[model samples]
Target chain A: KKALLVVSFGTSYHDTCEKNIVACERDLAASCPDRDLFRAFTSGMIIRKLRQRDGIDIDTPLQALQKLAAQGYQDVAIQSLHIINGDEYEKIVREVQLLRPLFTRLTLGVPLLSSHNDYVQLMQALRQQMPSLRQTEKVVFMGHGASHHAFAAYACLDHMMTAQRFPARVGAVESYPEVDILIDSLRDEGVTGVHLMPLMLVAGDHAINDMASDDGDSWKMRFNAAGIPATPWLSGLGENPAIRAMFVAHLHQALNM
Target chain B: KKALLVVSFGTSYHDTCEKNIVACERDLAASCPDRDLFRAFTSGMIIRKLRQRDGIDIDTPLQALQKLAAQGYQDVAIQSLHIINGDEYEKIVREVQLLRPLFTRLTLGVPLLSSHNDYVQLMQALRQQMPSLRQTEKVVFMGHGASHHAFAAYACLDHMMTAQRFPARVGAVESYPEVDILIDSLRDEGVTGVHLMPLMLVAGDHAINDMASDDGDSWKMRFNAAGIPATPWLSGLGENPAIRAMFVAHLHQALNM
Candidate 1:
């Protein structure tokens, strides 16, 4: 009779929190027939900090977790809804691990499709989501790098995406799959302009600054600087319910029988 | 004679690499006078897989360190100029830490300037270049997040910048210092317009996107969405030689002279 607690680093935007949390809830309910599931956001670190400044502790991840856990959730399985194993994950993991002794059984899910299986799922998701990529334009992606890792991921994504022929093109921010390489490859492929979207689960910072911000170094500004027209779609990948469900299924496998 | 190896994960644009690598080399040389730095470019781990298409021996940071060590430099600092601490840092940190025995004293510098003292120095350098924001229609600044770790730093910056009374107003990309928050707060202050510039030491990515892109979702669009007019300055920060010297000055202190 173990219940699941799905955890996330929640967003400041309530609209985003609703969309992100709902997906996890739905997928968890559907994926696990017998097990009950609950949702708790771990973005409390940010929330707490924000609340502390505002003199309010009502909106923190830890508080939410404590309340949910207190409400008779046995054997909680915490799944971090983080895009990468970056500092957020590090922080979340550290906190979760510190509190691990309390849980009957706590199995933390990997960041995203981090392992080979998840990678396969992610690529499948992307290809499935945008079958129109082959006909319309090369798919441009945006990723949020944590600022201490090499951006070479962009290069790998560049090769993988280019190798896909018409339907798929991958580009990332913060890490490689650099905009320039993608732009050049797109140009080489006769794509003068393309639709751009954040590869991140949420359209938070990366969507605003990295993908669409227009300083000379932003992808939008650079494409313009290079005389290439770039259109950025602020729609975060996280908003897509299908992508959100991926976390639920991952949790199901990681925690439930 | 121990030769210094300044290694970087290479760039995407063939042309930009030449410019970026030269800048990196120049920066390192200018920063570390006692250190005779050499250059080596490796494909990012992800890029290596994409390029090789075969399971190959991915070069570890230690391997880079070892290569540099073999070349004669005993006290080597493998300064990984990555954008953030993400998957790459996980691998790089693990590898570099494992090889801790091989070097005399390996100095690893990852990006975490949001809370450090040199960060203040960096701000002073940029602020010196910045015109008083008090009278600007609205003051905007841009920067590149190191990785996902530094992702929310933009929001933090938004908070910090808003606290200051300005020539008119001030804003930045990251939030801890929350410059953007300042600008947003100014909305309540009855300011309706802004003049933008890169807050970065080199105005690389942040300058380009968060400040200048013209999509319905870009900073321009965001400001427009928020009903504020945004005037963007897209020139990269590095293009300003004086500003470039600030980073050199920041890193020079690492030599322990």
Candidate 2:
């Protein structure tokens, strides 16, 4: 029988692992009901932690594919439940290159923010899921910004939300649209409060202790110190109904191609 | 366009909340392309925590229905993403009675183990997803056992699996097929170890600190003391593709009926 494997940058947080990774599997698996849904995580570190810490073993994409082959599975449609074609996504592509010979057909899906349509749909999802922005409330999204070119997806989302005139800003923890930058922009715009939310797939450690935590190094702390009341929406983008729909669309696009 | 509302007991784990609930949304939304997918959770306690604690607003079925009706959604198909026709599912059904007139058409879906066909499909899902039951290794499922008569779903599942002659057993954390009962059976049959997994949807807190935890009260701990090496798959039934497909099939059945 055919199979669909959900590949993600996993989390060691056992709870979020169920929500984001397993959740993505639930969503994508529905679209292709004919295929048995398989699961994988791209990050070996997360995979290892889940194994050693929790005694629950999760396969990386390559290892997953080998097992699919061993289990007499042929065609496989793999979906990358990710934000952008970042390093983790690159790893999946690399693994696909190595494991292509085993499957009769290996169709790989795109990330959450891959195509123009994906961006448009995501912006719609953002608009749809978020509260209507009051004049004083700015919705600022925190992304796992990267040094890679793919980090530009964050910038693009900011621009798209701006063009759409939704009172929102996008900032990354690691890269551009830095905390101070977002604070400066929010200040300049005369916004009094910000609805902070994660732009990641699963709101794991970063969403809890990083974005929404009461700790000094947290974004909520930073925003509060900057005089903006930040109310962190403790949810991953994967939690959004419309966001998961885009993933389903991306997978079909892969299967069609 | 029609709208799809996914309702469940919900979770405050924030992480598994994303996976089981939102992931189900992803899967069901794709199947009904014409519907604008909506969301709801039945647990008011969960709804309150996600609101007061995290500043995230989730709706009860009534609140969600009111929103859908206000938004001019005439046709709404609602899925009860729960394990049985138990209290949570009963809550949804009760609410549906009061709100049915608000929509042009409101169709409600069944729980995971509802129809006789659902049980059969679940059995198929079990047989397919699990590793072949070996002579020495039995598979035991941990359910959220209830005193409600609906808890018979767990018992029936146990009987069905036993009838199939598969080296497997079902036990609930709260109720029957109790830990000692399962251990005694395993010992009686000379089964040395068991592949333990959750029979619930998301495998949230119970799966973590209860079933799989190293704490003295944990299922794993109990089993280990019984000389039965317990291997818990830190996954919810919702994480299983076949299990999720059953959900999809249930939703479509609602849509069609």
Candidate 3:
């Protein structure tokens, strides 16, 4: 009757596994001390790749679900270690639903900034992130949005963030709820300098392509295009201890309250 | 008549405006030589914010599109400064399709690391970025993925990056094509250390939480779990000079064959 199923898309690199997903696992172990903690990765290619590698022969997510079910870990809380609530999140929900019959209790963690709590927490965190910024240097957060057909949650975050008084402005790297508005507003204020920061879960595709660099159309180049000096603080949001704690709080919510 | 249009989701922060839409306006002014580039933002909220700030009426994305149609430009490109191919990108495509009558031609800039060509360009760029990294300290990347649906195309970059072997390995921040399989592969190799870097255009959340952190559940933590030390060298890929060149290349593609 004891179970806490920790699921994430695994990684070959050690840092990602340890820093991002493991945070959730630690939070779970601490809060739900009595639950049997089980971890599984939903990626098939990653699983196959791992199998090919020596000494780590493990089942796929589906296989692990079956095995865990057979072991009679009745109560399970599923927490996904992903960035946004998009296509991937939906699919995981569906898979977990299929396995719902085997568990007596199951819940999922809120995606990044998915809940009211997260939104509030993120806004507060951003406000606190920069206590020393000069009013002239506007903070622009480049968010890694959900690709493909996803929700408007990112846009919501952007809007809510902008409406607030905090100097930290938000923009999506992929979708609408774009940050250009933030830029224009900054321009109107006669703010000539910008500090570009990553608002995404991982500083991967969006950060590199949209935030910095001096190509004719890169963000830095674009900033230079407008004669504004763009300085990027290239680090993911998850690295912040407060932000990590936010996810931990969400994980706690997934457990039967 | 020579005509141009810069598309964006406007922001309330005037300080951040110079990054793209404004930059595009500047670039078009310089690059076109004769063509006058116009700008438009996609959000009503942003337009409203701008109006309040500037004390003047601003055009919404739809209104901008209509206005662009009215201008009757000879050659037009909806140069979007977005990072990923997500809902917003598709929305633009649909809107552009509906507004195609406004110009003789319209080309849009694709997101960074979007296609096979982009992967090659990114890989090449990363190679140049890691000029000093020793053989043991390989470069790594992290990306923000959607919730549950396994975006396979995204993962293709992983193999493409590995196959080229120019710098190091690249991967995402969420659900794999699975996570354990990838980890097991790393375990099999029995590496002593990993130099984790963000594959993202920017160093966002993944780099911090997934790659660099000392949390027991993070990628670095997992590397530790597998007996590997994690060294994080993080910065936005966009900030890199070579990587930024890829955007210039993309612009050329949007300009024409």
Candidate 4:
């Protein structure tokens, strides 16, 4: 039988998990009714925490693959629900490679943004969902930055939005083009209002504490401290219908390849 | 006008510079004759040292992009000569994003081993380049490890090699599955002879000093101390024809994307 394994760097927030991650998995299963869809979490810490705190049990990528193999899965397509092909994606790739010998046909799907078509589609999707913006009201996206090469993908998405004349900017919580850098430009341009949103697949810890919290170091506070009134959008990228469709499209391409 | 830019983390060794880095650039230029080809070195230290010591000037990615824009080049493709999409590749992505506005079209190619096909192709290429291996001989690859998440790529590559049932192993100079780990495996398997090689694009300082040297802590010295004879292959991945062909293929995909 054919198996479709959906892997995610899972979140601890139960509400966000239900709305964002679990919702995506449901959509994936609906789109590929011919395949047996399974879920796996990549984070050990999150899995452990979920089991201890919520009586939840989620297999890791390795454990999930083993289960699929034992259940007579001959062909498997592994899809990652990561925003970029970053460190987490690499870990998934390693897992897929190790499990390659177990299946008759196995294909590993690229992350949400891997090709030029993906970037274009993501831009269109974000623009369609974005609220109308005034000249002085700029929307900024907050991504959890990595030292890994995939961090560039965030910058690429931001650049595309700006190039297409969207009144939007992107910053990372940990890497270059930080909120301070964007704030510097906003101040220089005489912008007075700002909208903040998470650029991650799930509105997890980073979205809650780093982007929208009322703490002094949060993005909202940083903008407020700079004399710019800030508004926060708590929805994650996975909450967007168009973005979720893009992940399904990527999976389709992966299966065909 | 359109241009293709080949980016490399250059080495100081003159012979390897000609055989590996320069050779790959020449092949890339030959592969796409319709477009003007440019070159850049991502390492600032290497760039400065080359100009100061060897009278050779190489452009940084920013400098090359600026020059391309000044020359009225509207489309550009940036190919990273990195084995893994680690920090070096991430830096290139940021550069492309920052300079996206200057070009009418810009695309970045994946690293050497970004896909499942890449790992399989790499295995075939390695086997084609390798001589017959005796049960007593173990081939070990020396990689430059990183703290970033891209470090997982190294482990993946190693796992693939092992899964292929080749008498090959991989160790990083600075990370997990270090030389000591591989040595223990070799000892456990009762292998007596060792073939050591660099798993980098350029067989430079790391290969000469760390893998093959008679220094007290070098791989050769360590293996000798462990009573196993060691031989070093001072060839980089760039010197392999199949590897170069894979790179050309990725660039083609990037351009088309």
In angstroms and one decimal each, the interface RMSD of every candidate reads 15.4, 20.5, 15.3, 15.5
What residue runs in model 3 are displaced by over 4 Å at the alpha carbon? A9-13, A40-63, A147-151, A179-181, A204-210, A213-217, B1-257
- Give the alpha carbon lDDT tens digit for every residue of A1-257 in model 4: 98889998899898899889888888888878988989998889999999999999999999999999999999888788998777788789878877889999998877876765676687778776578888888888888876665665565555445435568887688764578867876797789898888888888876778987879999999999999989998988889999889888878888884
Write model 3 residue lDDT over B19-72, tens digit each, in one string.
334544455456556657666666677577668777756665457677766766
Better of 1 and 2 by TM-score: 2
- CAPRI-wise, candidate 2 is incorrect
lDDT of 3 by residue, A1-257 (tens): 77766666565444645665566577767777887777777666766777787446545445667877898877667666655666666667767767778777667776665544566687777665554678777787776565543334554455444434467666665654345545565676788788887775445443566778655656666666777788877666656667767766777777637
**lDDT, candidate 2, A84-169, per-residue tens:** 88898999999898767555578999998988888877877887768877798988889988888998888888877878777788
Q: Which candidate ranks first by lDDT, i.e. highest?
A: 2
Looking at every candidate separately, what fraction of the true A–B Cα contacts under 8 Å does it contain? 0.02, 0.00, 0.00, 0.04
Each model's DockQ score: 0.03, 0.01, 0.01, 0.03
What digit string (tens of lDDT, one per residue) describes model 2 on residues B1-257?
Answer: 58999987777886786666677788898888899987777666677678889999887776788899999999999988899887668667866876788889989999998988887788788766588766899888888887567888888888888788766788888788777888887789889889888888887785678888989878899999988899888777766778778889888888784
| C-alpha RMSD by candidate, in order | 17.4, 23.4, 21.6, 23.7
Q: Flag the better candidate by TM-score, 3 or 4.
A: 4
Candidates, ranked, lDDT: 2, 4, 3, 1
A best-first ranking of the candidates according to their DockQ comes to: 4, 1, 3, 2
lDDT of 1 by residue, A176-217 (tens): 345775666566556656667767666665357777786677
Q: Which one wins by lDDT: 3 or 4?
A: 4
Clash statistics: count for each candidate:
84, 1, 71, 1
Which stretches of candidate 2 lie above 4 Å from their native place?
A: B1-257
- TM-score of the second chain in candidate 4: 0.96
